[PDB]
Each structure stands twice: as C-alpha cells, then as structure tokens.
Amino acid sequence: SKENLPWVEKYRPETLDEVYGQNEVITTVRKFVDEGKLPHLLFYGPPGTGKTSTIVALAREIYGKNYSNMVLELNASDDRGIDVVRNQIKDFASTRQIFSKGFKLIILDEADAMTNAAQNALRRVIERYTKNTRFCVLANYAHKLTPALLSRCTRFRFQPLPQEAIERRIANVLVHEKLKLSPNAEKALIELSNGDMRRVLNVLQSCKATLDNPDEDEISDDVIYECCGAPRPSDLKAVLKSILEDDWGTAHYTLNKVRSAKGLALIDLIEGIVKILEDYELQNEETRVHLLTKLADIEYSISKGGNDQIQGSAVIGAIKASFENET
Amino acid sequence: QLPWVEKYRPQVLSDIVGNKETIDRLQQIAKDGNMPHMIISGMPGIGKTTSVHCLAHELLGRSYADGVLELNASDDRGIDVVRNQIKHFAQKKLHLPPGKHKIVILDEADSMTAGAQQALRRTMELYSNSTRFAFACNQSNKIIEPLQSRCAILRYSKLSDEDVLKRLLQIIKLEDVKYTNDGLEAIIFTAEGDMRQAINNLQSTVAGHGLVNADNVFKIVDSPHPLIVKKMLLASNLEDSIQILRTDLWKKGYSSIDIVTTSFRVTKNLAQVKESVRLEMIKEIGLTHMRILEGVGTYLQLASMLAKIHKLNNK
Amino acid sequence: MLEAKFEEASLFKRIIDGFKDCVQLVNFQCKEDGIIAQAVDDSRVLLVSLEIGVEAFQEYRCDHPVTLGMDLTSLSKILRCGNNTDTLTLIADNTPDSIILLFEDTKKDRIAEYSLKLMDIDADFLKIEELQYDSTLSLPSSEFSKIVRDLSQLSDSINIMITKETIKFVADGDIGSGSVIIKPFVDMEHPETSIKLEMDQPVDLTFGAKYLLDIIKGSSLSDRVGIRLSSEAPALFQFDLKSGFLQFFLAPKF
Amino acid sequence: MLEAKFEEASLFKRIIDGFKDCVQLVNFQCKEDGIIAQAVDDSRVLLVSLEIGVEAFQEYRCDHPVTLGMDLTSLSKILRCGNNTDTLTLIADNTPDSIILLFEDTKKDRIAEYSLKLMDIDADFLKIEELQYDSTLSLPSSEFSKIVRDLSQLSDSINIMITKETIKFVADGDIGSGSVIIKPFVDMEHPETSIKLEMDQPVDLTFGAKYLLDIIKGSSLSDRVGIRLSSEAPALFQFDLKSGFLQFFLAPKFNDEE
Amino acid sequence: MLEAKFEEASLFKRIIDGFKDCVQLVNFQCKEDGIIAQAVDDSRVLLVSLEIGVEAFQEYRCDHPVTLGMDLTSLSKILRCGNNTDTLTLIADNTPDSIILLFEDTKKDRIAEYSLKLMDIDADFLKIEELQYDSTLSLPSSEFSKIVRDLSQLSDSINIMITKETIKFVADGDIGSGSVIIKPFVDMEHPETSIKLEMDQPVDLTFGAKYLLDIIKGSSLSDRVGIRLSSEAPALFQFDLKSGFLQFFLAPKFNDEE
C-alpha cells in the first residue's frame, strides 16, 4: 500500500500536471511530445527540483501504463561503463519495441557519475541511432559531462521551486492528510527549504509526528523550529541580545547555557547570527566589514577544529568590537 | 536538423581556424604526400579529429573508403584487434598513387591498453611504407614512449579570441542570424577556447531566443551572470553589492565556486580601476577561492571577500 | 478453438526445451493446418520458429484459429508433468485468457490439469527464411553439439567457414585457438551419420557461442540438423519433426 | 543401555533422511520393545514420529531404557558411512553424554566408529494421534510424491479434498491453478498400486506445500503411504517399515498455518 | 621437438585429471625416453610428478628435448574433446610459444586441433624421492579413496599410523572421531585386492585431508595405489601406468602443515 511509503515517495508526481514550479520547461516538453518533435533532453538542476519525476511522468504520458517495459532507465546504482554502453545501450537503440510500435526512450538518470570513456562512446550512439530512440540525461553538475555530449542534447535548467508552487504542493498535502498549518508556520517552512520539496515533505511528516495529538490542533512555528532542528530563532535572538546589550560574563554564560542545553553547534549559531544581522540597518559600513571578516575567519577556523569555548568567546568579542564602532 | 557543429564541420584544411603552424604543415603534407606517423594531442573541442579527417580525405581522394581504417574508443581496440584487424589492413594490398599511403586513424588513443600499444610498435614499423598511423588523443603522456618515438608530435593549443570570433562571424553570415557585439563577447567568454562548445552555445541561444544577446546568453546558458558579477564588484556601497549578490546570484541558484571564479575572471579582465587595487582584489578573491576549495564555501565567505575588496577600495 | 492432443507429452516437452532459456515470450497460433510458434530473444539476434502439422497429433480439431502468447518460463515450469508417456492435450477457447494443459494416464486414474495465464503480444510473425542460401549442410546433431561444445570453451565467437567439400568450425581466444574440420561423406552402413554439403558459394560467418549453445538443444528432437548459411541473412539451423520442424535463425556477428 | 544393530546401515540412513531438513533436534528413546524418536519443527506445525520394533534389528538388547537428544544435522553428517550394506550398531550407556555409531564390514577389515555429542532436551513426547479420522486413504508413495511435486510449483498451499470415492489435490496461485484427481481402485495385477479410500465424512484441508515436500521423502521407506485426515487434528502421513513406521503429523493451515 | 601420439585420448585426460584442481602450473618436458611433468601447489606441500615412457605411446619421436610450461586449467578446458576413443597427438617445435593438441577420429572425418599458449616457468625439477621409506604399503585405490572420503568428513587432518601388520587411518574433530583399520592379506581369488605392507619402522604421520582428497583421483589410472611413508620426508602416493606412473608427494603436517 502507498500508506507505508514516506511522504517524499508517496507524493511522487505520476502525471505532468502534478509537477509544480517548472512551467516554461513542462509546457515546452508537452508541446514537443504532442507535435512529435522530441529532441534529446538534458535536465540540469539541483537535487529535489523534480527532474526524475518529470521524466517519469513524461514517459508515462508517452507510452502509457506499460512505461516500465518500453523505457531503458539507467542510473548510478547500475553499472554504467563503456562495455555496458556498447552492449546494452546499442542493442536497445538498434532494436525495436517488444510491446508496441514507436520510438524508444533511454533515461540516463544521474549521468554525471559516468566515465569519460562511456560518454565518448555514447556521444556517437546518440548521433547514429536518432530516428528510432531518444536520450534523456539528468544532471546536477554540468561540469562532469563532456562538451561533446553536452552539445548533442537540448538543455533544460530546472529552477528552484518558487513560493507559489511550493505553497500549492503544501496545500495539496494538507488536503491529502488530516493536518492544519499556520500561515507564519508555512512561511517559516518555505524559508528553510531553498526550493527543495524533499526537505519540505520530510519535515512536514516529522512535525505531524511531533504533534502528539489526534491532529485536532494546528502546526505553528514552534513545532517546525523545535522539530526541523537547528538553533531555534528564540534562542538565536536571545543569544544575540545578550551579546549586544548584556555584560561580557553574562553573555558568555548565556551562550554556554544555550549551546549546552540543547547541544547546539557553534557553526549553526554563527550562521544564524549572520542571517539575522543581515537585516540590521547599520551605520558606516566599517562595522559590517569588521563583522563579516571576523565571522568568516572564525567560521574557517571552526571548519578545522579547535577549542569551542575560545571560538565562542571570539565570536562574542568580534560582534561586540564590530558594534562598538556604531556610536 | 543537423547541429551546426556537424553541419558546418570543416571538410577542407583551409576552413580550420586552429593553430596556423600545424594547419599549414598538414596542408603542405597533403599537397606533397608522404604523410608520416603522427600523434595529435590537445584539449577537447579545438579541431583535432576534424584536422586528421580533413588530412586523410584530401590525401586519399576517392580512395578514402578503402584506404582509411577508422577506429574510435567506441570500438574494441584491444590486443586481439591490433593483432588481427589492424595487421590485416596494414598487410592488405592496394594500388595507390605514388605519393599516398593507407591511413589508420585511431581516435582517443589515450584509452588503448598497454598490450595493444606495445603490439602496435612492430605493426607500424614493418608496414611503414604502405600504412601510416595517425593518433588523436588529449593526453600524450598516456601513450607509451616507444610509440611516440616512431611518430611526429603535434600539440594543439587553445583557440584565441580572434579565431573563434572569426569562425562565429562566418557561421552567422552563413546562417543569417541577428546578433550583437556583447552577445558574441559573452559567447566567447563562456566558451573558454572551446570552439565546439562555442558553436553549440550559439546554436542553442539561436534556437531558444533568436537574438544572440549577452542577456539571452547569460540566460539560456545562465551560469554566474558575469555582467552581474562586474556590477556587483563595481558597486560603490557595501549594501548594494550585498543585495546584488543575494538576489541576482545566490537566490537564483548560482554556486559559490562559479561566483568566485567568474569573480576572478571579471577582475583580471577589469580596466576601470588601477593595477594595484586590481591585484589586491584578486588577492582577496584568490584567498576566498582557496577557502571554498576546502569545502568552506558559503555566503559568509563571499560577503567577507566583498567587504575586504571594499576596504581595499576604501583607501 | 485450440484442441491438440499429443500421443506422448514428451514430444511437446522437448519442443519447449528448445525455446527454453534463450527466449522469454512465445507466440503460438493454432489453425487448420497445424500449430506454429515464434519467439525472439531480447537482443533480436535469435528467432525460434516452430511448425507442427496436423498429423503429428493423435487428435486435432480447429474450426477457428487462436493466437496466444505466453511466458516460456511459466510453460516449462508446468512442462515436467507429462511423465513423457502421459497423453497431453492443449485446450483453449477462441478468446482465451488462459491455456489449459491436460495430462492424463491411459486409465482414468490420474489427471493433471493446468490453466496457464496468457500474455498479450502484438501478433507480428516474421517470415525471414530465404529461397536460396549460399551453402547448405546437414550432419548428425550430436556431432554438431560436440563441435559447438568443444569450441565454446575457447571463445565467445565460433566461425563457420565453407569451401568446396570442406566445412570448418573455428574458435580463437585467450588460451589459444581450436578448429574442427569435417568433410562430406555418405555412409551406407547407416546414412543418418552421413555429412552432406551443397555449396553454391563459399561462406564464412561468425556467431556468438552463447547462441549456438542454445541452438544445439534441438538434438533431442532429431538425429540430424540442417544448417543453411548466407552472407545476406540470418543462418538457419533446422531440426525436423514427424510432420513439422523446429527452426533457429541466428544473425551472424557483424 | 542402548544396543541396537541394524543388518543394513541403509535402513537407518533412510529413516534419518526423513527427519532431515524439516527438523533440527530429535529425541530418541530406546526401551524393551524397541526404539522411538520424535522431532518437532520450530514453528510447531510438523511432528516426525518414529517407531522401530525389536524385530527390525539383527540384535537388540535393552535392560534399561535410555533417552537421548541430538542435532539432526550432526547425525546425518555422520550417516553417509554406512556403505548401505555395512552393519550399523547404535550404542550408549545409561547416562550418556554421547551416542556411538559403529559401522563394520562383514570381515574384520574396516571399522568406522563415531562418537556423537548429545543435546539435553526436556523429555516430552506428544501423543496426538486420533482414534478415528474423517477419512483415510493409501496410495503408492511415488504417486503421492509426484502429486505433491506437481502442485508445489503453483502455490505455497495445496488443498486436499475428499468426497465419496474421490480424492482431489488442488493448488492455485499466480501463474494459474492445477488439480490432480484420483479415484479408488483395486489392481489385482499387483495391489501395491491400488488406491484405497475409506471416508466417514468428507474432508477439505489445506497444507503448506513446503511441508508436504518434506514429508514425501518417506517414499524411500515404503511403497505405499497412508494419509489420515481430520478437521479436528493434524493430518497423519504414514510410511510403514518392517516392524515399525515413520509418521508425519502436519497441522492444516488455519488460513495461514502450514 | 615434441611428437607424442596417444592411442586413446582418454589416458591423457585421466592423467591431467590428476593434476587438476590441486595445482595451477605444470612443467612438461619431453625427451628421448619419454615425457615427464611436475607441478607444485602454491603452499608447496604437494608435488605432482608424472613419467610416461616411450612404450605408452602409439607413436613417439624425439630428437631434441623440449620443456614447456602451462596453465593446468587451460589444458583441462581443452581436455574434454578426446571422445576418449579419439586419437591424441601432442606436438611442439624446439622453441615453442604454444602446444598443439590434435584429436582425430579413425576416419579422416573430424579433426579437432588446439593451439594452447604456453607460460615461461624456470626449469627446476625436484628429485625428492627417497631410497628407503620407513614403511611401504599398497592396496586397491578405490579402497584408499573410500578410506579418505570417510575420515575427511570428521576433520581437516587424517593421521596414518603403521605398526607391525597394522595400518590405521584416523580423524578426530568436532562431531567426534573415526578410524579405519586394515590388515595385510593375500587374496589369490584375485591379488589386485590384496593389501601388502612392508614395515621397517613404525610410522605415524598426519596429512591435511584436503590434499589426500586431491590425491585419490589417481584411482582412475590404476587399480592399486602404493603409499610410502617416512618421518624424514614427504609421503609418496603412487599410481602406476603401463610404462609410467603418476606420483603425489605430500609433506606431513608439522602440527599444522598439510
């Protein structure tokens, strides 16, 4: 049953109408398939944008419910070498379908992990067998693909999911599940996503599990912040306030108790304070220069280890000395 | 329709805008004959396979079909193939003009195994009067020294801005495309001496927008927004540069590596500011790039780089 | 409808043994003059084609052709109940969702009946057999099996070369090379051991050893095997049945 | 003490072949009237029960019963030394830590002797056999094996249905369905091929094919197999020995119960 | 050059069956008085040594010795074309890169010819056979195979002990212990079944069962096997051929040494 799959897998789009966010490429692909001229596709984009779902729904719309038999889907999990190409891909392209009549589809998912020799052998397979089969290459990094292979396919860049589409998908999930979501909670959820539907679905399932109730209540910002993890905005602003206004020893004690009560990390607090202070309308940019320089130096030092207490005191002193120029 | 890289693939050695010295060398060789064993090395997309194809075609005339043996990396090129098929082709009898020879083209020679490369030595040595070998590779170090000792070495270099610009102008004239100077400049900038990639990006921009303009090129082939990077670096106030970096580059999915590397290029090629301030900005950009290469690539590092650049510009 | 009764379930079991392993799906079609069946492997280099005339059966009735496709593996799984001596009757209506295999012993005693689920396969029987082949030869099938089994060990490719009065099988690989040379000859002491050869043109073709190995299975259906080769088409290896034949068409290696 | 000599090591080897695979631990007990053994599988759906009377042996001496438990796998590992024609003597003292298997050829020549480590098993022999079963039938065991081997391919469950003068085995699964129908008959040309059936009440039970497959092994001990079925208890499949028998009691599937 | 024709390809196939599995590389050398071959396993506890005199062949010609090394696996892969009744001719020039095996049927009909690639092996034939061994015994090889096959199941070590008129094979491991005791005897009803023993000194050596298992293969070449044991050297197990012999020298376990 589908009620056992996680929310990332349960809500996988099955038709091209369930793929939100991508409109300029989805409409163009639909037109390509309806009019017949479907060229070799290269779906390039970040993880969680919906490239695999898009190509799966496309193959479903093209071949019907028997997609799993008329399409050759290869990925990084399968052995993709030069001999694998030579045998499997060439035998698939040269032959015809065993279930119906029509062009074939080879979905090379995650083809950014293929060997250079494999791509050099495949670039002439794409150019030779081009009247009975097509090629779809999915990629997250366009630098791992040879320029020869990169030039034979039409490139489609999957942009990160915008606010409207991600809110539409959130509303669809809240309709499918007996769940309610607060508006500010929804905004905070969209903020910590960066256009990644996987993260949204995962944390939505997790906060539904956090509810502890039969779901007669709503999901507020507190639930998301306590469940999604990472220094809560409350503790973040409390530490920032104690650093900016309170005394040195009191600020040290506050930072220590905050980072030791929930086991928070100093790097997460650093990034959070950087994100919060970005909205601060400040005086002459010298304070911002000092703050950014010292915080980046402390982050680079943390990225290699050291004393957490010394680095926390360094963060406190850096923020304080940077703000002392604003007077 | 056929892509412009394949449709406008050069068929005569004069159409190649590559390295002039080696091109005239191969042209004189095809004119006089007596083609020796050769190994052409370089980088992808500079006219290596097309060069040897044009040389073989011009040298063999109509006998190209029965006098040229093409073996790519897509075909088996092991010890057994070199032992049987290459030797049978080299021993094959063929009546040719008194200035021509049978040509064995081996594309991607850097992928052949050590056994095949070792067996090819005497194969090319005993039949060096009726069979000639032309290797096309990207790394000459992958081919054993005994094989390199029996052949000429042609190292192809990157294509300068002028040659790629001339080839693109010829293609535009042959295709009647609407373009502009800044668009072609952005195309050549994103090509990085890669003629094949340049023609591919040009054709993609044409088929996607019709007009070859820098905005479209930085849109259909969007990667780091150079002009946007230049406007970010040339900002007068820190908040403006920070907002540009946040909205235009970071909120649109541009990776930090692309931002810093595009940043380095913009600076190196900058002319608005003096030399010393440019060197200091490159030094800051360089340190930021070093930090990112270690996996510390975030928005805070780029913000600190911009802050240090502004502090340098702050007299 | 389909109604075909084999005297001995064994004949059908050996026939299916021939499709076994090398193909997954088989398309059968019964009609007024008998039963035919075709199966093509995934790579499309091998076609297995069967023909069983009305006379090969103890009872055959057909007033309306029926085409039915099925999974070969499922069929063989069920094809070991024939006791070989059991009687086998294939039964199906005009628009079947299944094929019934009915095995019965002489006496009323034991009746094993199966209802095999069918697969829908687009009817598209191939007719790739040639009028004339470059060369034609027949020899004992056990001999052909040995020849194939020898050479197979040496390479994944076995070459068949034919010149006037000479047939030569060759394999050459890592450990070395091997060859089996046979010459045409009429043995009156029993002509089922003779080796005939009619050559209109010398031929020299290479085949994948894995496929020739699949093909040799036909030895169990006939004493002799006919091999027809051409430079223009797939080679034909044929095993005759009483009223019928099992044919294997194999595309030469390019 | 235990002192049992088999004329042919082969008989014991075939008997153990019957416990083999389907059970791990076997509890033997020798006594004045012979040897018995019981083994139950982990899921407790199958009981293998053996009885060998004094007359099945060439020599048997018992003045004091001994109970001994052992790992079936260990026993079979050792049970391929009998040459089949070798003589086999099982030996054990009254408080054993081991069981001795002694194989000897007619002549003094070769003597293979084993000392198998025993396991301690709480003595708890079951006595689940019924007075009357709903239906009783016997048929050649090779025929029963074929019937089981046929149907097994189709499903993990094989149903046995009995009505007046009719015995029907049925399997139905993914690829389709199958059935084997047999009828009672007396063959005078040799009655070891007859199929008898005594039905007091029609029965219809389902068994896990994996278990029936374990049970068919008894064919090697007897020409015929007796099958006794009831809606009140585990079914009994029995293979007679000269002075003895090997019995398999199998619990019907409830809907899902082997 | 090498030119040796075996009447029946079967003899050579059985000989190679003896080297099979237990060794990977074999070094052959043909000469005026026949063919010899030696192969040593990787651990160096087993040496397989062959000698085939000129008379074992139907035709043998040698005017110039040739030494050739080869992979045993490659050779056996090719050694199943003999039809057993086929004629086999081994052929090689004086400085070979290959060895030609030519199988032909009586009639001109079918000719299977192989060209096996050779390996370069430093010629270094061992001559470890002793003048006198502590004890010497021969018995039917099928009997020796059974003895080895029995005990092997019990342990990875099988001990051979010899005392006046007594030969005893013993294995002792996890499941228990076993022993096979045989006594010398002359059977006139057919002396190929006799068991001879000449003991100059009692011996007691242990061998790795995995190796004795490799050695028993020689049964297919001879009815009897000769076993020579010494406390000073590897044991010798020998299988005689018509004009020749196949010998297996096995180093005793030191305590842990195959």
Ligand SMILES: Nc1ncnc2c1ncn2[C@@H]1O[C@H](COP(=O)(O)OP(=O)(O)OP(O)(O)=S)[C@@H](O)[C@H]1O
């Ligand atoms: N545009 C979208 N609309 C709706 N759901 C989406 C969308 N993009 C992603 N998802 C969800 O995220 C899941 C994963 O999508 P994928 O297509 O596998 O991600 P991806 O774009 O292929 O990136 P990868 O696999 O990491 S390279 C889907 O099953 C959906 O539940």
Ligand SMILES: Nc1ncnc2c1ncn2[C@@H]1O[C@H](COP(=O)(O)OP(=O)(O)OP(O)(O)=S)[C@@H](O)[C@H]1O
């Ligand atoms: N000098 C040149 N003049 C004109 N077109 C060129 C030139 N060099 C490359 N091209 C174009 O690039 C295409 C491919 O060139 P190739 O010679 O295949 O690249 P390459 O230099 O061999 O590098 P590889 O093949 O990746 S190792 C040609 O078909 C042309 O369209």
Ligand SMILES: [Mg+2]
């Ligand atoms: Mg994916």
Ligand SMILES: [Mg+2]
């Ligand atoms: Mg190239």
